[PDB]
Amino acid sequence: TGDERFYAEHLMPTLQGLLDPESAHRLAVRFTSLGLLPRARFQDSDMLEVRVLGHKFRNPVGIAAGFDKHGEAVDGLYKMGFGFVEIGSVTPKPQEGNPRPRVFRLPEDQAVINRYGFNSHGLSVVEHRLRARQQKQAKLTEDGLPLGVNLGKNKTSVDAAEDYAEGVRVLGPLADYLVVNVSSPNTAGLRSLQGKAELRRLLTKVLQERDGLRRVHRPAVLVKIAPDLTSQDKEDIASVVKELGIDGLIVTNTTVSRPAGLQGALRSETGGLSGKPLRDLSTQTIREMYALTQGRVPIIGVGGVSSGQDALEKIRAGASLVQLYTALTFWGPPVVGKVKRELEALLKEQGFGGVTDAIGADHRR
Ligand SMILES: Cc1cc2nc3c(=O)[nH]c(=O)nc-3n(C[C@H](O)[C@H](O)[C@H](O)COP(=O)(O)O)c2cc1C
Ligand SMILES: CC(=O)Nc1ccc(-c2ccc(-c3ccccc3)cc2)cc1C(=O)O
Ligand SMILES: CCCCCCCCCC[N+](C)(C)[O-]
Ligand SMILES: O=C(O)c1cc(=O)[nH]c(=O)[nH]1
Numbered sequence: 367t368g369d370e371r372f373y374a375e376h377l378m379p380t381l382q383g384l385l386d387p388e389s390a391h392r393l394a395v396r397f398t399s400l401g402l403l404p405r406a407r408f409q410d411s412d413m414l415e416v417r418v419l420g421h422k423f424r425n426p427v428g429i430a431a432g433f434d435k436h437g438e439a440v441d442g443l444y445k446m447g448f449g450f451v452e453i454g455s456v457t458p459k460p461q462e463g464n465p466r467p468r469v470f471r472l473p474e475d476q477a478v479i480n481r482y483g484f485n486s487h488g489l490s491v492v493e494h495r496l497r498a499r500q501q502k503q504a505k506l507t508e509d510g511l512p513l514g515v516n517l518g519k520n521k522t523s524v525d526a527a528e529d530y531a532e533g534v535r536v537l538g539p540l541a542d543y544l545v546v547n548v549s550s551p552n553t554a555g556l557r558s559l560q561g562k563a564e565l566r567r568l569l570t571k572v573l574q575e576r577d578g579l580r581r582v583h584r585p586a587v588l589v590k591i592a593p594d595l596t597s598q599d600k601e602d603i604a605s606v607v608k609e610l611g612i613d614g615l616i617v618t619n620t621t622v623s624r625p626a627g628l629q630g631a632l633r634s635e636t637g638g639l640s641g642k643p644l645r646d647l648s649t650q651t652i653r654e655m656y657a658l659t660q661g662r663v664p665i666i667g668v669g670g671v672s673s674g675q676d677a678l679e680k681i682r683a684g685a686s687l688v689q690l691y692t693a694l695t696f697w698g699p700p701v702v703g704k705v706k707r708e709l710e711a712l713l714k715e716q717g718f719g720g721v722t723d724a725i726g727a728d729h730r731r
Contacts, residue, residue, distance in 0.1 A: 368404025373698035387469045387478065387695070395434060398442035406447050408703035413710055413720040414449070415510070418664045418686045419543055419586040419614055424510035425449035426721050427677065427705055430668050430689035431516035431545065431590075432480075436487040437495050440503070444511050447702035452514035452689065453492070455547050458532045459520050460488035464552070470637075471695075472630025476672070477641030478692050479632060480620070483552045484518045489536045496540040507542055515541035516590070518550065526559060527571045534575040539583035546572055549592035549619035551638040557592055562602035565589075569610050590616035591655075593647045593669060594623055600651075604658035614664035615655055617685070618648035641692040645670025649683050653728070656684025661726050672701065674708020678716075682727040 367373075381390055397403070414425040428450040429443050435454035443451045463485025470479045487495075496503070496515075503513050517533035519526050530546055538544055546569065548559035559568055569589065576587050589612055591603060607615065620638025628643060648669025656665060667685030671677050672693035680688050693701050709721075718724045 368407070368700065370697070370700040370704055373404070373700045374696075378696060378698045382471065382473070386467065387471050388466060391433075391469070391695075395439050398446065399439040401442050401445055403442065403446055403699050406445065406703065408447060408706055410449070410706065411710060413713055414706060416449075416686060416721050419512075419588075421507065421512045421542055422510040423449045423512060423687060425706055426681070426687045427702060427709075428452060428514075428666070428687060428689040429694070430691040431455050431514075431547070432482075433691050433694065435485065437492050437515075440513065441499070444506060446699050447706065449510070450512045450514060450687070452516055452545065454486065455484060455516040455518040455545075455550065456489055456492045456533060456537065457484050457486040457518045457520045458489050458523070458529050460491065461486055461520055468637075470630075470632040470635050472628065472632055472641070473696075474629035475633070475641065475643055476692075476696055477628070477630065477639055477643045478695060479635045479637040479639050481552045481635070481637035484521065484550065486518065489533060493536050493540070496537070500540060503540075512542035513540075514543045514545060515585075516545040516547050518547050519553065519556065521553065527568045530568065530572050531575045534572055534587075535579075538576055538579055538585050541585045543586040543588055543613070544576065545588050545590050545616055547590045547619070549590050551592070551620060551622045560591060560595065560599060560603060562606060565603065566606045566610070569606060569612060573610060573612070586613035588612070588614040588616050588664075588666065590619055591651070593618040593621045593644060593651050595651070600654055600658060604655060607659060607663055612663070614666065615659075616666040616668060616689075617652045617655055618644070618667075618669040620644065621647060623647070640669070642670050642672070645676060649680050652680055652685050653683040656726055657729065661729065671705065672697065674705055674710070674712050677705055677709045678712050678724065681721060681724045684726045684729065686725050
């Protein structure tokens, strides 16, 4: 029917009652890849346009990594209304991830816990999948609909930095921006790459490889961090980011914390928690990183965004763009248009000429 209320109150609840989360996810990717979606309707206004990372974004709402892990539904996602698409978290070689079940719903908390473990088709498969639509994407990007590629590492890799280096060389030429994901809570020792010494070495290699690509194929490089960092960790990341000239940060992957108050029966499953319970922890992390980097480093805010208010709070905290995933798993496609519509209304209501004017607003009051 293509209606917010119908999807949230009937279609989605029914779907989740018939299919486990991973099955619903696979089914969703299929329908999305085929463009079988409800009306978009919402028309992006000039107010939502953002210029950052060397690109124009029709609107600041993107689909976070993890929904389209292998780059199979990019075009369908733009059709859904996202201002930008970030694909997967691709590992050099293909790998299956953890055994099932590996993802769980916490309906009473509007949250999800996942421990997929980097299931990925691998760089080669994704490379050819993106090459098949490389020129179509070039036009989309020019039209204000950029593509991001999230890089991960193989479970059995003996050289983490080389895994990311490979990703930069293979998919960097096909992306507007690359994401060095060192914040997955489901890969042993991965988060330790967020440490100062280890991060500096890793990012120096990544940036060298990126700089070695032809200008037209030279993507911006961002680092995606966890919401569970100590104050010391954040200070160190900010320092390395400014020292190396990292282009941006994606703030907050899922959390390994289990906030008091979770009601879901599956709250104690191992994995990263996403959704509403993560929202403010992520917003506060965005706020801190913005201040530590003097507002000079673009931030993509993500974690628990399901409304215009959620989006604006992250923008005012310092995010230039935001992403969502879990909200889509509960409310369906209509949630994209809802967030954009509510965000536009709030911007006007609060006297902002547009999204750009609101970025980091809280720090100036
Ligand atoms: C099932 C699932 C799979 C995910 N896979 C990835 C991934 O491969 N790479 C990554 O950087 N983040 C991944 N994420 C994290 C999301 O990109 C995002 O940082 C986090 O879920 C917070 O946003 P949300 O509350 O809107 O879901 C995943 C999240 C979920 C729920
Ligand atoms: C862990 C995870 O990714 N879960 C999920 C991921 C996606 C979805 C989904 C998203 C979009 C539709 C859709 C698409 C086209 C037309 C109409 C509806 C359907 C299902 C549901 C879940 C879920 O847990 O239930
Ligand atoms: C992904 C399973 C959820 C089932 C709903 C599929 C909705 C079809 C939307 C109809 N349409 C393409 C015409 O807009
Ligand atoms: O593949 C996964 O398990 C995964 C990766 C990541 O970066 N974040 C997450 O929540 N899950």
